[PDB]
């Protein structure tokens with residue numbers, strides 16, 4: 001395929017959101033924020049990457065039945081930022097992202113990809129900041145990229 005053929009390094013995480021408004025804001029301003037635990041997981045992966053490869057994020061709104069696109073993580077986490085900018089006050093902090101695809105892809109197109117690090121559960125059954133093994137992540141990314 002033409003998409004993601006060169007991604008020898010780097011790491012891929014599921015992002016789950018309770019709020020489609022939060023996603024809209026993320027797309028508009030190219031920023032995101034997770035829980036404290038999820039921020040720490042993404043921060044560790046971004047920093048240990050040391051710019052050697054991409055950290056990609058596969059976004060999905062809880063209950064929507066579809067993934068809604070792909071962004072690249074673009075900064076470390078900043079834990080002390082303006083409160084109350086998201087749909088709930090409980091999302092504290094900020095990191096930069098760069099959205100690559102904004103498009104709805106039905107879970108039917110992805111649910112036969114299983115995560116060997118998550119009890120072989122479908123990737124579509126992941127929780128927020130579930131890490132995706134690199135070879136399964138390539139499959140997901142190419143399906144999203146090419147979907148029509």
Ligand SMILES: COc1cc(=O)[nH]c(=O)[nH]1
Nearest residue numbers: 017018019022033034086
């Ligand atoms: C950044 O805004 C959100 C982050 C999250 O992890 N879940 C949400 O519903 N919104």
